[PDB]
């Protein structure tokens, strides 16, 4: 069984700074790109960041795109997001989700395989 | 979907002939490769025989000719004490040799060996040396050693060598454990006929390898996991005379002999001898049925550099008669002594065209060394003789862990990758 | 991780060592061995041709705009890279190698007449 | 359509050829062939070293920064490329190549520095 | 303004003058003229293909992703490139080329990596 688990944040101010990470496990870590999805409390889903399983290309949605990093750590199972200037509009369940690229000799994916459960940012 | 995408750097290669280069005075295991080896096809043994007698050739370009001595030689009975074995094994003789001064001329006498001479028109007093009618001989230089020092084969670039470490490979057919290596270890030209020496050792059994084992026609080459040792020697003290017959020409020959004239001869320990025997049986036994006999016997024919076993005993060349050592019949502190024979003018290779002749050496002979492998032929009952004639199996006994193959960096597979 | 330390490593492993193998591939008595490296140096620079040739010039991965044919080879991703050998794979498709590279070259003119007249 | 099977052509037909020549420039008793080959190989890489210099390197076809003089040659270009053959053309402007070369590279020279300074 | 007349300048005059050193490097009795030859030749192959492997191929001056480390010289700028000749640079960092050079190549093969998934 794979596991991803959030172990995020609380409650911060707007023009703040909050890091979310989520652990995995049950899988080989190192073979998956992964992304955030955001959902706002009374929204659906959105992308926000995606990072390359060896942690050298990473993509934004541009509302995010100065304002966040996406990292990873492929020796500690560690995916990591650092979010930085905190809009009240960033309030959402960040989800850590397996999936949404591939790369090169792999199969595709443009799917997200797994998910966690979410964190809960909240903006003051 | 998928597109071509193009790799330069690609680990692969494939079988090939090139040129490997010398060097005298590393590994890489590749943990998952099998490849496939086949001694007897392996063309580093072909580069080995060439450079081989190539060099033996260079070696004596700057040395003394001894045509100004095909002349005709007085040949009376040595004056000494002489045991049965050696009666009519020597012959002193004199004869007019040239000097530095082409009108002048000098009487010399020397000792040669009878087979070493051929009498002229069934004259007991005339004869002459063996090489006058065929091409002139050459004086081998005494600054020279006929050491058997090591070279190793080194790959060009471009190119590697892959050693097998299977230790009951038998030289074909897939090798399950296989490493890259720069350059081989060195290998000793060490020249013989029937017994292999001072070569390699088996790991842990004794390998009986054959191109094919059930064809008499080819030579069984056997490799020992245990050495026995030989010891030979010519036990007759020389003293060894020069005279010049050129301008800065000068022939070495055996003056004279001090003491008595034995024969020379090799000594193995009688029981070490059986037991490597025994060991041949046994796995000759798995080619061959359980409930079956092997036989071993004597060379059946052909002149002395086929019959005997051949070898460089300290610059000497001996002809030692291994009659002692395959005799006997396997059905499901004594020692063998072995008489010996000593030439002068050789031929070293199978060659028409060459002789060499070898300068005496002053004093009384010894050297020790290990059999490491033989040399069999096949004819119920299978019979074994000694063989060997063929210097390239020699060579084959070391290099057959060996293959070169040329690296073919590029090639192409598909990815999902497109410009 | 030395040279061809990777040869029995699968192909998408074993493509991580392409810079151990390309710098090995560079470094009468004594003229075989003259004969050997004058050799070495025009085979290496038939293969520096080809790639320039190709529009792979400098590089070690090139990608290019040749499709796939499965009638070469119907293995699918997983099964070539993760499961493969390079020895393996040049063997599978040794038959069709001249007619993947006449494509390239075909592939690579157009390209480059279509570049010089974008250029105008 | 095999090597120089175009020379006889005009130029616009001969530019698609270009592969064909390009792949024929490689490939005591023995010496005077050694000489040849060395020589081949080294006339071979001073004209690859050459297209580098200009920034030419890895392509047939490669388009500078250097204006035509008219005083090299005053045909237009429906003229030499379809009413012309190379080995015409070579003889027109034999004169004028060594001034066009020395052009190409103090280009180059410039082309290099300037996009260092933009990558500060 | 001839071969290595700027050898006595300083580094960032120097630098304007790398076409003529580069054209520079290229053009039994006889044999050891061979044998000269084609040393020389393997020599300027093996530079070529190194500047291939760390993404150099094609030009003089090429930029890298490798940072500078201050251990390996804590010069400025100037102290570099206004005075400095590159007889005494390369002395001052001789010790430090393998492993620069090392970094450079896997500087770029991290590169090729991430272009070839940015194009599937
Ligand atoms: C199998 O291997 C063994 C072990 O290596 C080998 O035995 C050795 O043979 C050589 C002769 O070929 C012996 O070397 C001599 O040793 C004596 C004593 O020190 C020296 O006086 C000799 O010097 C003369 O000869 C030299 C040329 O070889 C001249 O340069 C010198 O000026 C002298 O004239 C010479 O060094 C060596 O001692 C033995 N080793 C042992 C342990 O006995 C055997 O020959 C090999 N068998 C075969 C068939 O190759
Ligand atoms: C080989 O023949 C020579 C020549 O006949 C022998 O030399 C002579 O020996 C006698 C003694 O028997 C001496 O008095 C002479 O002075 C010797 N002559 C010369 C020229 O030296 C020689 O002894 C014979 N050797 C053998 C082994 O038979
Ligand atoms: C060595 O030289 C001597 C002298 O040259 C030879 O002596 C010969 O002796 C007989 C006996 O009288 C003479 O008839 C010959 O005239 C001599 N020969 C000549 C041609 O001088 C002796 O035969 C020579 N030995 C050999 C075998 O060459
Ligand atoms: C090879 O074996 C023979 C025996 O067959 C050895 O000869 C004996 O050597 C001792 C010591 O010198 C003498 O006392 C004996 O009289 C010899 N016996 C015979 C029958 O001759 C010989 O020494 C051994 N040696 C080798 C190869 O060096
Ligand atoms: C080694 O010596 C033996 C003698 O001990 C030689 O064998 C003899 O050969 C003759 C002629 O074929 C036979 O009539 C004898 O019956 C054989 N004797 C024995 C005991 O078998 C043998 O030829 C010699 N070998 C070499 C290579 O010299
Ligand atoms: C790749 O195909 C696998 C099944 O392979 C089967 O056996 C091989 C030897 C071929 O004959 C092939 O055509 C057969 O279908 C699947 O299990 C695997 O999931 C597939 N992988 C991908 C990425 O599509
Ligand atoms: C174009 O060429 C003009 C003439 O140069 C002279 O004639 C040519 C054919 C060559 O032989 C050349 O060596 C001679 O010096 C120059 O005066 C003019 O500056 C050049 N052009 C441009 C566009 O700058
Ligand atoms: C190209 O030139 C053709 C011929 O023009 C005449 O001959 C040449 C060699 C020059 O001397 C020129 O000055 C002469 O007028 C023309 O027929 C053709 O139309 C021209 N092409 C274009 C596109 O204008
Ligand atoms: C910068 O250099 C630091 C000092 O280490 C010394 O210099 C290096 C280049 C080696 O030669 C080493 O053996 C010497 O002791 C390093 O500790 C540091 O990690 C380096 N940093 C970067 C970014 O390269
Ligand atoms: C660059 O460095 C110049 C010289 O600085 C002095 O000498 C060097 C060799 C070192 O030992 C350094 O620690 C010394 O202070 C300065 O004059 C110059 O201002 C510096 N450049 C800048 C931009 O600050
Ligand atoms: C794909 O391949 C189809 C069949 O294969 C053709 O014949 C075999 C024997 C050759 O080895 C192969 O290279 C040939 O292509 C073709 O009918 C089809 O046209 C090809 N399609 C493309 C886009 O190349
Ligand atoms: C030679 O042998 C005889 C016996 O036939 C013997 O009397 C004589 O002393 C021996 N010669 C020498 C020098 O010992
Ligand atoms: C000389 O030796 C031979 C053997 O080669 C022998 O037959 C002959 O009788 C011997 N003659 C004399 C005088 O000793
Ligand atoms: C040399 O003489 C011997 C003995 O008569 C003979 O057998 C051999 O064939 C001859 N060799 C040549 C090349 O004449
Ligand atoms: C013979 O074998 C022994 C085994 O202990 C070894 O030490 C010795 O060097 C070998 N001799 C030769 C000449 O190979
Ligand atoms: C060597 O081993 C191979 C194993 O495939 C076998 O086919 C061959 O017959 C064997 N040859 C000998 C002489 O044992
Ligand atoms: C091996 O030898 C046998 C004779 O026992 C022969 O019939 C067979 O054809 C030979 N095979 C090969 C590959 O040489
Ligand atoms: C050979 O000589 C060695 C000493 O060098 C000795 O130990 C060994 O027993 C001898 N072997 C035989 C068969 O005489
Ligand atoms: C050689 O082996 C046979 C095996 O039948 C044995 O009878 C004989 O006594 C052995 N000889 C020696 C010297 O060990
Ligand atoms: C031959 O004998 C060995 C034991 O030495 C045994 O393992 C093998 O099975 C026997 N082979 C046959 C065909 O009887
Ligand atoms: C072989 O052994 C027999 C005894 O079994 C013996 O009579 C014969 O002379 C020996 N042959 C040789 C060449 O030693
Ligand atoms: C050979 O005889 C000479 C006579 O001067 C002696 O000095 C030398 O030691 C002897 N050598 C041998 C090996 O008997
Ligand atoms: C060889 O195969 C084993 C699996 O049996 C694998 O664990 C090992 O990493 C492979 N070796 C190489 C060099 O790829
Ligand atoms: C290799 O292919 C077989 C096809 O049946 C598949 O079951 C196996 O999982 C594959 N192994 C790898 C590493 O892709
Ligand atoms: C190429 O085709 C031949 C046709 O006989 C076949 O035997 C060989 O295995 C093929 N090689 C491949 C699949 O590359
Ligand atoms: C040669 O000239 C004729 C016109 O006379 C033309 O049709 C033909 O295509 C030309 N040959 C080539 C190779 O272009
Ligand atoms: C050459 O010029 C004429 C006009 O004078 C034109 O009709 C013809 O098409 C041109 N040539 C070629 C070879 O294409
Ligand atoms: C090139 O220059 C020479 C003088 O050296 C002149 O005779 C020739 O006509 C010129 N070439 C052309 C095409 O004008
Ligand atoms: C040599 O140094 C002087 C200053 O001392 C400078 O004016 C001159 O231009 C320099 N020459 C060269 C070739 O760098
Ligand atoms: C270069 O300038 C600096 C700063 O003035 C000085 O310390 C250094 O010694 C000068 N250079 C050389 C190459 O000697
Ligand atoms: C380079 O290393 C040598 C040997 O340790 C040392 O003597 C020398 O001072 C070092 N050079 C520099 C610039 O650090």
Redesign the pocket.
């Known amino acids: 069984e794979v596991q991803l688990v959030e172990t995020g944040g609380g409650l911060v101010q707007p023009g703040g700074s909050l890091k979310l990470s989520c652990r995995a496990s049950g899988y080989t870590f190192s073979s998956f790109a992964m992304s955030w999805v955001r959902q706002a409390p009374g929204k659906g889903l959105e992308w926000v960041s995606l990072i390359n399983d060896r942690g050298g290309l990473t993509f934004y949605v541009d509302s995010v795109k100065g304002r966040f990093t996406i990292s990873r750590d492929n020796s500690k199972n560690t995916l990591s997001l650092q979010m930085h200037s905190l809009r009240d509009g960033d309030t959402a369940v960040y989800y850590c989700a397996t999936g949404g690229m591939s790369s090169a000799l792999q199969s595709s994916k443009y799917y997200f395989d797994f998910w966690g459960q979410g964190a809960l940012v909240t903006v003051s | 979907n998928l597109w071509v995408t193009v790799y330069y750097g690609v680990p692969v290669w494939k079988d090939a002939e090139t040129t490997l280069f010398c060097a005298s005075d590393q590994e890489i295991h590749l943990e998952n490769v099998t490849e496939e080896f086949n001694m007897w096809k392996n063309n580093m043994v072909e580069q080995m025989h060439e450079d081989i007698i190539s060099l033996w050739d260079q070696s004596l370009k700057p040395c003394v000719k001894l045509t100004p001595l095909c002349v005709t030689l007085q040949c009376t009975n040595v004056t000494n004490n002489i045991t049965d074995d050696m009666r009519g094994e020597l012959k002193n003789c004199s004869f007019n040799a040239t000097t530095e001064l082409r009108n002048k001329r000098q009487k010399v006498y020397s000792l040669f060996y009878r087979l070493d001479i051929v009498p002229m028109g069934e004259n007991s007093t005339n004869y002459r040396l063996i090489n006058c009618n065929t091409s002139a001989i050459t004086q081998a230089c005494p600054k020279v050693?006929?050491?058997?020092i090591p070279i190793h084969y080194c790959a060009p670039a471009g190119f590697a060598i892959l050693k097998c470490k299977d230790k009951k490979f038998n030289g074909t057919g897939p090798c399950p454990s296989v490493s890259t290596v720069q350059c081989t270890h060195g290998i000793?030209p060490?020249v013989?006929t029937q017994l292999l020496?001072?070569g390699s050792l088996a790991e842990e059994e004794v390998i009986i390898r054959s191109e094919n084992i059930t064809n008499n026609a080819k030579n069984i080459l056997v490799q020992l996991n245990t050495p026995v040792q030989i010891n030979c020697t010519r036990p007759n003290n020389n003293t060894v005379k020069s005279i010049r017959i050129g301008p800065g020409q000068a022939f070495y020959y055996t003056g004279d002999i001090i003491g008595d004239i034995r024969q020379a001869h090799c000594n193995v320990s009688k029981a070490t001898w059986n037991e490597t025997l025994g060991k041949v049986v046994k796995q000759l036994r798995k080619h061959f049925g359980n409930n079956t006999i092997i036989r071993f016997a004597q060379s059946s024919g052909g002149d002395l550099e086929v019959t005997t076993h051949s070898?460089?005993?300290?610059?000497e060349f001996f002809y030692c008669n291994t009659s002692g050592l395959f005799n006997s019949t396997w059905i499901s502190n004594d020692s063998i002594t072995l008489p010996c024979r000593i030439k002068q003018i050789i031929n070293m290779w199978q060659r028409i065209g060459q002789a060499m002749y070898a300068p005496p050496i002053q004093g009384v002979i010894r050297?020790?060394?290990?059999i490491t492998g033989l040399i069999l032929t096949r004819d119920t009952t299978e019979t074994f003789r000694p063989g060997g004639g063929d210097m390239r199996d020699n060579w084959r006994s070391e290099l057959y862990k060996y293959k070169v193959v040329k690296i073919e960096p590029l090639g192409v597979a598909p990815t999902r990758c497109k410009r | 991780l030395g040279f061809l330390g990777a040869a029995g490593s699968t192909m998408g492993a074993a493509s991580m060592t392409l810079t151990v193998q390309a710098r090995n591939l560079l470094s009468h008595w004594g003229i075989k061995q003259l004969q050997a490296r004058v050799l070495a140096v025009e085979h290496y620079l038939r293969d520096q041709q080809l790639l320039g040739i190709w529009g792979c010039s400098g590089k070690l991965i090139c990608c290019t705009n040749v499709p796939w044919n499965s009638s070469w080879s119907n293995r699918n991703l997983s099964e070539i890279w993760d499961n493969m050998t390079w020895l393996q794979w040049d063997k599978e498709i040794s038959n069709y190698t001249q007619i993947i590279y006449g494509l390239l070259e075909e592939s690579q003119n157009q390209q480059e007449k279509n570049e010089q007249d974008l250029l105008e």
């Open positions: 050693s006929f050491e058997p000793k060490v013989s020496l001072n070898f460089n005993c300290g610059g050297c020790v060394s290990n």
